Short mmCIF file of C-alpha atoms and ligand atoms in Angstrom, two decimals:
data_model
loop_
_atom_site.label_atom_id
_atom_site.label_comp_id
_atom_site.label_asym_id
_atom_site.label_seq_id
_atom_site.Cartn_x
_atom_site.Cartn_y
_atom_site.Cartn_z
CA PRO A 1 -1.78 -34.98 -6.92
CA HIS A 2 1.49 -34.64 -8.82
CA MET A 3 3.47 -31.44 -8.24
CA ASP A 4 4.94 -30.02 -11.42
CA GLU A 5 8.60 -30.98 -11.78
CA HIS A 6 9.39 -27.32 -12.59
CA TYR A 7 7.01 -25.64 -10.13
CA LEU A 8 9.88 -23.99 -8.21
CA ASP A 9 11.30 -22.58 -11.48
CA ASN A 10 10.81 -19.11 -13.01
CA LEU A 11 9.29 -18.13 -9.65
CA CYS A 12 10.20 -15.48 -7.09
CA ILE A 13 9.42 -17.24 -3.80
CA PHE A 14 9.24 -13.88 -2.01
CA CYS A 15 6.60 -12.01 -3.98
CA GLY A 16 5.20 -15.02 -5.86
CA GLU A 17 5.62 -13.47 -9.32
CA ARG A 18 6.39 -15.78 -12.23
CA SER A 19 8.05 -14.64 -15.45
CA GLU A 20 10.09 -16.10 -18.29
CA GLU A 21 12.77 -13.52 -17.50
CA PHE A 22 13.08 -15.00 -13.98
CA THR A 23 15.99 -17.22 -14.90
CA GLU A 24 18.49 -18.02 -12.15
CA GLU A 25 20.06 -14.59 -12.64
CA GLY A 26 17.01 -12.79 -13.89
CA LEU A 27 15.99 -13.54 -10.30
CA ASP A 28 19.20 -12.06 -8.88
CA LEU A 29 18.43 -8.80 -10.68
CA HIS A 30 14.81 -9.05 -9.53
CA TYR A 31 15.89 -9.24 -5.87
CA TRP A 32 18.51 -6.51 -6.24
CA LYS A 33 16.20 -3.91 -7.80
CA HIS A 34 12.54 -4.83 -8.19
CA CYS A 35 10.95 -7.32 -5.75
CA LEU A 36 8.45 -5.43 -3.57
CA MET A 37 8.97 -7.85 -0.65
CA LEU A 38 12.70 -7.18 -0.38
CA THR A 39 14.89 -4.19 0.42
CA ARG A 40 18.59 -3.39 0.26
CA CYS A 41 20.02 -2.94 3.73
CA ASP A 42 21.51 0.56 3.71
CA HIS A 43 24.06 -0.46 6.36
CA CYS A 44 25.59 -3.59 4.77
CA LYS A 45 24.22 -3.30 1.16
CA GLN A 46 22.79 -6.85 1.23
CA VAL A 47 19.27 -7.64 0.01
CA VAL A 48 16.99 -8.72 2.87
CA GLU A 49 13.34 -9.64 3.27
CA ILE A 50 11.41 -6.67 4.65
CA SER A 51 9.54 -9.06 6.95
CA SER A 52 12.96 -10.14 8.32
CA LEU A 53 14.63 -6.72 8.41
CA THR A 54 14.60 -6.13 12.16
CA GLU A 55 15.95 -9.63 12.80
CA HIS A 56 18.59 -8.98 10.11
CA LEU A 57 19.72 -5.71 11.67
CA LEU A 58 19.94 -7.21 15.16
CA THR A 59 21.43 -10.67 14.53
CA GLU A 60 22.87 -10.92 11.03
CA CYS A 61 23.93 -7.60 9.45
CA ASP A 62 27.63 -6.78 9.13
CA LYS A 63 26.69 -3.70 11.18
CA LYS A 64 24.57 -5.51 13.82
CA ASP A 65 26.84 -4.51 16.71
CA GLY A 66 25.79 -0.91 16.07
CA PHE A 67 22.09 -1.64 16.80
CA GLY A 68 20.03 -2.47 19.84
CA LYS A 69 16.43 -3.60 20.20
CA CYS A 70 13.86 -1.24 21.66
CA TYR A 71 11.81 -3.38 24.01
CA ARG A 72 8.82 -1.10 23.36
CA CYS A 73 8.55 -1.27 19.57
CA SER A 74 10.80 -4.36 19.04
CA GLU A 75 12.69 -2.51 16.28
CA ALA A 76 16.43 -2.05 15.86
CA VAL A 77 17.76 1.39 16.81
CA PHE A 78 21.31 2.71 16.60
CA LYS A 79 22.90 1.80 19.92
CA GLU A 80 23.86 5.40 20.71
CA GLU A 81 20.31 6.71 20.10
CA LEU A 82 18.54 3.93 22.01
CA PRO A 83 18.50 5.65 25.46
CA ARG A 84 16.97 8.81 23.94
CA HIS A 85 14.65 6.62 21.82
CA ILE A 86 13.56 4.81 24.98
CA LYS A 87 13.21 8.05 26.96
CA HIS A 88 11.11 9.76 24.28
CA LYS A 89 8.56 6.87 24.23
CA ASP A 90 7.35 7.98 20.80
CA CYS A 91 7.62 4.64 18.96
CA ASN A 92 4.58 2.49 18.22
CA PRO A 93 4.41 -0.38 20.76
CA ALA A 94 4.80 -3.91 19.45
CA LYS A 95 2.42 -6.85 19.88
CA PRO A 96 3.10 -10.60 20.13
CA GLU A 97 4.30 -11.99 16.80
CA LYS A 98 1.44 -14.51 16.77
CA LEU A 99 -1.03 -11.63 17.06
CA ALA A 100 0.42 -9.20 14.51
CA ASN A 101 2.91 -8.54 11.76
CA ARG A 102 5.04 -5.45 12.35
CA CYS A 103 6.22 -3.41 9.37
CA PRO A 104 9.72 -2.05 10.04
CA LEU A 105 9.30 0.56 7.27
CA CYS A 106 6.09 2.31 8.39
CA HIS A 107 5.90 0.90 11.97
CA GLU A 108 2.33 -0.44 11.66
CA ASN A 109 1.07 -3.55 13.42
CA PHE A 110 -1.39 -5.49 11.30
CA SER A 111 -2.99 -8.90 10.59
CA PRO A 112 -0.44 -11.70 11.06
CA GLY A 113 0.78 -14.11 8.43
CA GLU A 114 2.35 -14.27 4.99
CA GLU A 115 -0.76 -13.29 3.02
CA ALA A 116 -0.99 -10.12 5.13
CA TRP A 117 2.69 -9.32 4.54
CA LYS A 118 2.14 -9.49 0.79
CA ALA A 119 -1.01 -7.36 0.92
CA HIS A 120 0.69 -4.74 3.09
CA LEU A 121 3.89 -4.44 1.06
CA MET A 122 2.49 -4.92 -2.47
CA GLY A 123 -1.23 -4.23 -2.37
CA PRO A 124 -2.94 -0.98 -3.25
CA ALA A 125 -3.11 1.66 -0.52
CA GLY A 126 -0.84 -0.54 1.58
CA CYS A 127 2.61 0.44 2.85
CA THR A 128 3.50 4.08 2.24
CA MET A 129 7.19 3.59 3.07
CA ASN A 130 8.13 0.84 0.56
CA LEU A 131 10.54 2.64 -1.76
CA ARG A 132 10.30 0.00 -4.48
CA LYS A 133 6.54 0.59 -4.71
ZN1 ZN B 201 9.82 -10.98 -6.02
ZN1 ZN B 202 22.44 -5.14 6.85
ZN1 ZN B 203 10.93 1.91 20.31
ZN1 ZN B 204 4.67 -0.72 6.01
#
């Protein structure tokens, strides 16, 4: 069946919301301040997907050379604190990406997939560490 010619318009592809105010730059303001699926990186001040934040910090951020990956929790840690982080063994261990999503804000492992990401970050009684919520 025919896809609407303007289906990709007035839509935030990250949280799914549609709105007349979501013009091309109504969307830029949406990402910068409001979208529950995104965050501003405190280190480089860019907007990033929360579900991509660890990968951002380790491989993309302007400040990526200041982070290393904890092989226990899979999260980015400041390079200087990583030995102590590793020694303290207090982080929540990670699971295979096919088995679980991992929230970098609250450190929970949960049901994999995009629908789960949305329910965790935007749903009721979901993520307690999402500062836009
Ligand atoms: Zn959004
Ligand atoms: Zn960054
Ligand atoms: Zn760790
Ligand atoms: Zn969370």
